Amino acid sequence: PYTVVYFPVRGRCAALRMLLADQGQSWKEEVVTVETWQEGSLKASCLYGQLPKFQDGDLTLYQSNTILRHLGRTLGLYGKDQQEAALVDMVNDGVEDLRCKYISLIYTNYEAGKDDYVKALPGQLKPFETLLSQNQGGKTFIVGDQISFAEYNLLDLLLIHEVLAPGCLDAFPLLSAYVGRLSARPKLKAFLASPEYVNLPINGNGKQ
Amino acid sequence: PPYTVVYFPVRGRCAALRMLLADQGQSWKEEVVTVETWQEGSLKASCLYGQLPKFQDGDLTLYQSNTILRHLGRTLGLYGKDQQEAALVDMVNDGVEDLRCKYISLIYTNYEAGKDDYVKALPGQLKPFETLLSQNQGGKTFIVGDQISFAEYNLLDLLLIHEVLAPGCLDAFPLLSAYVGRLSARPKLKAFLASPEYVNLPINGNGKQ
Ligand SMILES: N[C@@H](CCC(=O)N[C@@H](CS)C(=O)NCC(=O)O)C(=O)O
Ligand SMILES: N[C@@H](CCC(=O)N[C@@H](CS)C(=O)NCC(=O)O)C(=O)O
Numbered sequence: 001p002y003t004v005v006y007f008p009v010r011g012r013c014a015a016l017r018m019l020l021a022d023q024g025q026s027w028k029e030e031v032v033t034v035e036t037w038q039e040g041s042l043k044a045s046c047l048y049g050q051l052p053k054f055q056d057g058d059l060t061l062y063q064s065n066t067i068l069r070h071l072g073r074t075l076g077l078y079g080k081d082q083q084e085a086a087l088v089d090m091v092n093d094g095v096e097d098l099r100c101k102y103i104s105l106i107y108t109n110y111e112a113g114k115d116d117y118v119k120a121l122p123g124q125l126k127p128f129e130t131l132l133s134q135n136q137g138g139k140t141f142i143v144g145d146q147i148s149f150a151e152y153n154l155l156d157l158l159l160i161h162e163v164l165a166p167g168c169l170d171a172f173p174l175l176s177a178y179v180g181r182l183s184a185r186p187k188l189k190a191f192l193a194s195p196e197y198v199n200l201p202i203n204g205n206g207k208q
Numbered sequence: 209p210p211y212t213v214v215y216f217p218v219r220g221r222c223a224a225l226r227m228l229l230a231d232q233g234q235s236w237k238e239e240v241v242t243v244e245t246w247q248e249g250s251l252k253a254s255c256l257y258g259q260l261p262k263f264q265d266g267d268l269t270l271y272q273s274n275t276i277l278r279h280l281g282r283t284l285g286l287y288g289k290d291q292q293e294a295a296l297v298d299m300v301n302d303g304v305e306d307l308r309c310k311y312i313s314l315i316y317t318n319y320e321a322g323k324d325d326y327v328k329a330l331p332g333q334l335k336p337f338e339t340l341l342s343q344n345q346g347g348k349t350f351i352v353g354d355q356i357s358f359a360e361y362n363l364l365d366l367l368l369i370h371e372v373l374a375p376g377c378l379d380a381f382p383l384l385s386a387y388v389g390r391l392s393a394r395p396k397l398k399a400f401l402a403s404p405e406y407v408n409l410p411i412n413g414n415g416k417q
């Protein structure tokens with residue numbers, strides 16, 4: 001039903017894969033190698049000349065957040081109403097902003113910029129702890145009473161930052177319990193422990 | 209008014225949502241934040257991500273310009289007529305956001321040394337929108353479906369500021385050109401665009417465009 005077209009890395013497809021798995025969905029992975037990409041035809045056929053590319057029936061989508069939002073809308077992972085939907089987007093956009101800063105670090109100046117990035121991290125993670133504290137004491141989800149698509153994206157972002165800076169969640173009790181809680185959902189837990197996830201590099205330049 | 213926009217005195221990331229509100233005949237309050245106020249630090253520390261725009265829809269307080277655009281798109285019916293169009297609208301907006309981030313990097317961090325390469329790469333960055341437009345009714349109406357969506361105000365602002373950055377950049381794209389003309393002629397939007405409230409605000413905060 002679903003097909004994910006992407007390079008052999010977790011990157012911008014980790015969240016959407018976690019979402020599919022946790023939700024019991026089935027999908028096909030169409031892996032694109034660098035040689036295949038450098039050939040030029042696939043790229044030229046992509047709307048924005050980039051991956052991921054996603055297929056749902058005969059609907060083809062581009063843009064990782066468009067895919068996440070589409071799955072959130074069709075599978076009911078977008079809040080109970082417009083008010084919560086706006087809050088879900090606010091969380092996702094906040095995640096996207098930090099993922100971009102992370103990507104810039106990883107691909108453009110890991111070596112010289114890592115120390116400054118790590119020092120600024122607490123202040124970049126805190127907004128999510130505050131959001132959790134404002135909804136049911138942070139005991140359940142970040143928005144409302146049900147999981148939303150933005151949470152798979154936030155979970156991946158937290159997971160890759162713990163790799164980048166072990167212990168970065170330690171001073172954030174709500175985020176820490178949230179990560180353990182989400183990571184324990186049965187289907188998500190199996191997915192996170194599987195080779196499909198574990199043996200795929202986080203990024204394409206071997207940095208993390 | 210049920211809406212309040214809190215931002216610096218620039219068009220920037222608030223131009224598209226303002227256009228949307230004006231084009232939809234909605235009322236809103238403009239709360240202007242000066243640089244001195246910002247440097248004072250307390251408004252900033254109270255902002256969810258330490259940044260503006262901040263938006264209030266009654267007691268619903270939002271941050272993130274695209275969260276605000278999506279919210280208004282959802283509450284005003286500018287988000288497609290079904291799930292498939294909603295996804296396409298999002299795809300347009302995410303593409304707009306990506307190019308806006310590049311424009312922003314150019315403007316604030318590398319104007320002098322980067323403008324040549326930026327402009328040379330610009331046609332390749334605009335083409336996807338021409339392609340999207342060509343695939344919907346021959347590009348004679350909206351970018352997605354048969355009604356206007358929130359992404360379009362964002363796309364229109366993006367195209368307008370790029371024409372200031374690179375005069376004639378749209379001459380290579382017939383559909384985008386006529387599209388801009390079309391949207392810019394909507395009565396309420398046209399009036400807004402020619403008004404002091406829009407015209408007397410700089411596009412960016414460092415004086416470059
Ligand atoms: N805004 C896009 C960004 C996609 C992107 O940066 N894709 C990269 C891989 S992470 C790519 O396709 N690179 C190959 C190229 O640009 O030629 C999204 O969120 O999906
Ligand atoms: N992803 C955010 C970005 C917001 C942003 O970059 N805000 C800038 C002004 S355009 C800001 O508040 N700068 C002040 C600061 O960071 O201290 C959005 O789309 O709203």
Ligand SMILES: [Ca+2]
Pocket residue numbers: 144
């Ligand atoms: Ca409630």
